[PDB]
Amino acid sequence: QPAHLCFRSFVEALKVDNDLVEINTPIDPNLEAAAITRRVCETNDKAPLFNNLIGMKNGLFRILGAPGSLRKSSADRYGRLARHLALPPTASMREILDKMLSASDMPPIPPTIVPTGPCKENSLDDSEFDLTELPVPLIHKSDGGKYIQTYGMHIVQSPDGTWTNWSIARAMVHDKNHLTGLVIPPQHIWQIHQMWKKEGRSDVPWALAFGVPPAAIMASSMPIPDGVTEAGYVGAMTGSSLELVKCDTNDLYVPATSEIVLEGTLSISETGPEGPFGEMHGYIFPGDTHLGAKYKVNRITYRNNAIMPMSSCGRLTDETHTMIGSLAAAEIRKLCQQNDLPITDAFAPFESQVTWVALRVDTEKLRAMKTTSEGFRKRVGDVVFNHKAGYTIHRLVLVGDDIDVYEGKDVLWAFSTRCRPGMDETLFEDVRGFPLIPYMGHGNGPAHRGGKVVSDALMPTEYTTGRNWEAADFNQSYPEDLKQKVLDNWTKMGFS
Amino acid sequence: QPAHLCFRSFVEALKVDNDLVEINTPIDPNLEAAAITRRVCETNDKAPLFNNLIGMKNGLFRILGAPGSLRKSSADRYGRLARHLALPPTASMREILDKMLSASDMPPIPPTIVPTGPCKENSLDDSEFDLTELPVPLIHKSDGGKYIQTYGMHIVQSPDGTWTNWSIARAMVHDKNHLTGLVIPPQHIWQIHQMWKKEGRSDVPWALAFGVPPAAIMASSMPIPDGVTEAGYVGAMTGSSLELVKCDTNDLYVPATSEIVLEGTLSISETGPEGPFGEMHGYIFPGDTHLGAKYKVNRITYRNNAIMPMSSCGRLTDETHTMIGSLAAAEIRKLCQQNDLPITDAFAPFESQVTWVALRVDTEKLRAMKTTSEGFRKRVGDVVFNHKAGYTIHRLVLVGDDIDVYEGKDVLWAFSTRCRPGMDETLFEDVRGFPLIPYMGHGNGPAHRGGKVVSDALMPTEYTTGRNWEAADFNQSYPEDLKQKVLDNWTKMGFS
Ligand SMILES: Cc1cc2c3c(c1C)C(C)(C)CC=[N+]3c1c([nH]c(=O)[nH]c1=O)N2C[C@H](O)[C@H](O)[C@H](O)COP(=O)(O)O
Ligand SMILES: Cc1cc2c3c(c1C)C(C)(C)CC=[N+]3c1c([nH]c(=O)[nH]c1=O)N2C[C@H](O)[C@H](O)[C@H](O)COP(=O)(O)O
Ligand SMILES: C=Cc1ccc(O)c(OC)c1
Ligand SMILES: C=Cc1ccc(O)c(OC)c1
Ligand SMILES: C=Cc1ccc(O)c(OC)c1
Ligand SMILES: C=Cc1ccc(O)c(OC)c1
Ligand SMILES: [K+]
Ligand SMILES: [K+]
Ligand SMILES: [K+]
Ligand SMILES: [K+]
Ligand SMILES: [Mn+2]
Ligand SMILES: [Mn+2]
């Protein structure tokens, strides 16, 4: 099966790409696997495949770290993400994001039910497994539990059956047959959970599938609209109907080639201790445990020689930057355009810890609007900060056509030089805030409200008559013929 | 003579360091010299020495570009600056800045008058030179003149004789015997000029010396206090009295080994067209010419085979970043400490286009102050933004002890994650602003007032009981023995 449709094939692809290190000697899931993966992510090294994990038994499990992290070279920097999507390994971020958005103006392609698949090769009933006995990793030394779930897909369905959501939300082992995790607004797992809670009759049927089709884990990480079934979006994106098999103990459907599947329920009444966890912004607050959602596991099914993907998240650069930030930016770009805003491109700079999004403006269209900075900033911020796709983002930076938003150096240059602090900014205190940013949940103000800003790095004439400067750089401050002469004589003269 | 005391020896040092490219074929001062230098600065390449400049005659002049720019390797990144100061080429920014501050608690060492020096080897009187005939460079294609003065030292003295100031301020050729340039508040050349204007009796005696002792051009670029004669500060810093010779046509004193010396007057009454110029923030606004100060040149003296240093300034990284920003940061650090603020380190991130300064706080001392963010931010901003050393800086970022302010990635991480927009910031609208930043002089508000901010990236407990997190990074999230094992097995396992 193709790499984008089958996680086991994706691992093969990374090998072929010389983007995998297989470690066949014993590695401890207590910190060691995650420490190696952390170093990989901080250095953009090859993805680690831990084939000999201390405590692996009943055939559960090997670990792949850094599945969505960056490669060292500029030419294939985003190659691991490209391999989730059937794209060439040299694909740009713009091409990746365009692929992820493509299904938003296509009919869904619903999944196809098949009678079995690799994920049924082995099973353990509720007398046979113990989650505390599996080689679940301790990812950061101060974590409040062993985080089994960092790169699987939670599957829940609305009570009426009309929306089945696929998403990534963290979860850790509670005891032999339960997990605790985050289920928080405005996320779709929360929205669905609230539907079940209001009905009040039963716990939520649930499954958690690890090592799903790579195209599916990408949509799982993206804030596509409310009420949209990810399976149909991924079908449209890939041009093919995804093959799903029914769970054994409930009527949910999981990808046929899933590495590992947990079946059970998400409680509408029970909670348990969850966290702390070393998170996307680069921090852990030791001891900050709070009550989280509680999951009961009834059954495990899995492939022969199952592989568990793992994100060792924190400081730059890992899946929480490359996927959470970029995919939110993509959805924001679309949102803006659908609201008649002249936004061509959006990206969450990694340098901002993916807390900013830079919005590139078609300034010809802006000029025709005959507006001002104050008005335009307010409009943009009301659209984005009142929408779920804006949830994680606390600063929007508006830039004109000369800036490549996918280049952090250029966004930083424009922000620092074109946006006057205070005057060229609008603060938003009555919007939903993202509590995981330290200055929110551990800060001086309300954890869940405010702390957002639109920073206008458009210069005045960009609203009126057009750009009135040239950059003082090699590109813009010298005529073409001179530039080319310099380049052509560069190494002759003695330069590198 | 040592490299730090003699510009001709400094050029030799760069050669020996394999940090110089000598170009002996003809190079045009109309854009070509500056284009090559621009590319050098954008790539951190070796400094260019143009030995065969089209239009060089009466022995005037060769050009050295990029005298204070960065080298490619991390180990000697600041080596060119180190060579201005007798420091090892691996010197850190902290050691450079400490050397530049060292004279601030030493007695001055006044200069020594000597009867002649290399700068007297040749002369041209006012019937023999024509500034329009010299190979003065056109540095950026849209510049409003040929900027002769980008790395020389203006020398002016108070009417009472008690303060002689050395500083860099730009100037361009007006006609055969005049320059125009910037003379603006709160700069010391302006302060002195105002003294002469109030006396109202004569033009200001002036000299402009190019290719001065490297230690002298560094102090020329630093905002040491009002009323302090740079020659005595540089004497103290270097531990030696600088050797000066009297001008021929006035009673000012210039470094004995100066490459080129202009003698004349700065008018107290006349102005002429000046600019535009491709400036430190990365911009030129074509056509933005304004009236500037006017200089009359009466005499030129110069060394055999004179070399003119040139800054081809603009986008990162050149002398306007490495020297203006870092040296202002140094002076700010001292200022803060002298005002009883618990600041250990300061640096202007290059990523901010040197418009920010990050201030590292001794948080043990902060805790003893039993204060709050609001109070502390106001205190810091009142001290810095009301002082000349703060003039160029529009954002101060307060960070705790874990952050290395000389590492832009780390400052950006702390700013983005620890400072809540609005709430954790104090805006300053009634302070002097820096008009050359585009969002000031070409922005939406007053060019000369306001637009400043203190951004507090201290977390709440840093004021009270101490840091309450660990980073989610390899360094902080894993025990020492594990880290060392990982490192020791890194290349064995198959990583880079
Ligand atoms: C890629 C990715 C996405 C994480 C994530 C991680 C990764 C690796 C982790 C597992 C390492 C740690 C935590 N994360 C959470 C998370 N969203 C959330 O609500 N809680 C989480 O705990 N997300 C983001 C969530 O997937 C996106 O916001 C989706 O838009 C959610 O899908 P939905 O729109 O269908 O709700
Ligand atoms: C290194 C450096 C410093 C420039 C500078 C440049 C460089 C290369 C240029 C030449 C390429 C272009 C312009 N610059 C000006 C300038 N200060 C100023 O008032 N006007 C200028 O035009 N400075 C900064 C000025 O040197 C510092 O602010 C000093 O503190 C001034 O000395 P003072 O404190 O004695 O006034
Ligand atoms: C290396 C790329 C690549 C792409 C898709 C595949 O299915 C694959 O299988 C080994 C490899
Ligand atoms: C906890 C992580 C996290 C990540 C992204 C989200 O959109 C989110 O919404 C509650 C939560
Ligand atoms: C290479 C360093 C260096 C340092 C000081 C000198 O005077 C010098 O003369 C050639 C060279
Ligand atoms: C024009 C440049 C410039 C650079 C630094 C300064 O402190 C300054 O004060 C007026 C001016
Ligand atoms: K999703
Ligand atoms: K602006
Ligand atoms: K000075
Ligand atoms: K703060
Ligand atoms: Mn969804
Ligand atoms: Mn001075």
Q: Do A451 and B422 touch (CB under 8 A)?
A: yes
> Same structural domain for residues A231 and A379?
no
Å between A495 CA and nearest CA of chain B:
7
Q: Are A216 and A166 in contact (CB under 8 A)?
A: yes
Atom from ligand 6 closest to the CA of residue B170 = 1
Question: Which residues constitute the domain of residue B110?
Answer: 1-330
Q: Which of A285, A313, A330 is the last residue of a domain?
A: A330
Token couple for A458:
């458009």
d(CA A37, CA A41) in angstroms, rounded, equals: 6
Q: Do B423 and A440 touch (CB under 8 A)?
A: no
Q: Which of B330, B358, B383 is the last residue of a domain?
A: B330
> Same structural domain for residues A310 and A338?
no
Q: Do B373 and A40 touch (CB under 8 A)?
A: no
Q: Which residues line ligand 4 at a C-beta cut-off of 6 Å?
A: A 182, 184, 187, 324, 391-392, 436
Whether B492 has a binding-site annotation, put simply, is no
Residue found by looking up tokens 């990480």 in the block = A221
Neighbours of A447 (CB within 10 A): 16
Structural domains of chain B, count: 3
> Same structural domain for residues B181 and B204?
yes
Phi and psi dihedrals of B259, rounded to 5? -65, -45
> Same structural domain for residues A134 and A144?
yes
Atom from ligand 2 closest to the CA of residue B166 = 35
> Same structural domain for residues B428 and B442?
yes
Pocket test for ligand 1, best of A148, A310, A324 (most atoms within 8 A of CB): A324
Q: Do A459 and B478 touch (CB under 8 A)?
A: no
Token couple for B462:
């840093």
**Does B350 lie at the interface with A, CB-CB under 8 angstroms?**
no
Q: Are B125 and B107 in contact (CB under 8 A)?
A: no
Phi and psi dihedrals of B396, rounded to 5? -105, 130
> Same structural domain for residues B417 and B477?
no
Please report, as a single letter, which amino acid is at residue B371: T
Distance of CA A193 to the CA centre of its chain: 21
Q: Which of A305, A330, A355 is the last residue of a domain?
A: A330
- Name residue B153's beta-bridge partners: B209
- Enclosing H/E stretch for B171: strand B171-175
> Same structural domain for residues B178 and B199?
yes
Burial string for B414-443 (b: 16+ CB within 10 Å, else e) reads bbbbbbbbbbbbbebeebbbbbbbbbbbbb
Catalytic residue among A279, A319, A331, A425: A279
Which residues of A are less than 8 Å from B409 in CB distance?
Answer: 316, 351
The torsion of the CA quartet B226, B228, B230, B233, rounded to 10 degrees, works out to: -130
Residue B65 CA: distances (Å) to CA of B27, B47, B211: 13, 6, 12
Distance of CA A165 to the CA centre of its chain: 15
Whether A127 has a binding-site annotation, put simply, is no
Token couple for A216:
């599916």
> Same structural domain for residues B395 and B325?
no
Burial class (CB in 10 A: 0-12, 13-18, 19+), A369: middle
**Does B170 lie at the interface with A, CB-CB under 8 angstroms?**
no
Burial string for B447-484 (b: 16+ CB within 10 Å, else e) reads beebbbbbbbbbbbbbbeeeebbbbbbbebbbeeebbe
Q: How was this structure determined?
A: X-ray
> Same structural domain for residues B356 and B445?
yes
Q: List, as own/partner pairs, every contact residues B379-382 make where C-beta atoms lie below 8 angstroms and the sequence separation is at least 24, other chains included.
A: B379/B341, B380/B336, B380/B341, B380/B454, B381/B426, B381/B428, B381/B452, B381/B453, B381/B454
Pocket test for ligand 4, best of A182, A393, A437 (most atoms within 8 A of CB): A182
Peptide bond into B446 cis (omega under 30): no
> Same structural domain for residues B229 and B363?
no
- Name residue B254's beta-bridge partners: B245
Token couple for B257:
């080994």
> Same structural domain for residues A298 and A149?
yes
Which residues of A are less than 8 Å from B395 in CB distance?
Answer: 421
Residue found by looking up tokens 């090699």 in the block = A474
- Choose among B72, B353, B474: nearest Cβ to A35: B474
Q: Is B3 in the pocket of ligand 5 (CB under 6 A)?
A: yes
Burial class (CB in 10 A: 0-12, 13-18, 19+), B160: exposed
3-state secondary structure of B90: coil
Q: Is B293 in the pocket of ligand 2 (CB under 6 A)?
A: no
> Same structural domain for residues A212 and A317?
yes
Burial string for A170-186 (b: 16+ CB within 10 Å, else e) reads bbbbbeebbbbbbbeee
d(CA A290, CA B189) in angstroms, rounded, equals: 61
Resolution in A: 1.2
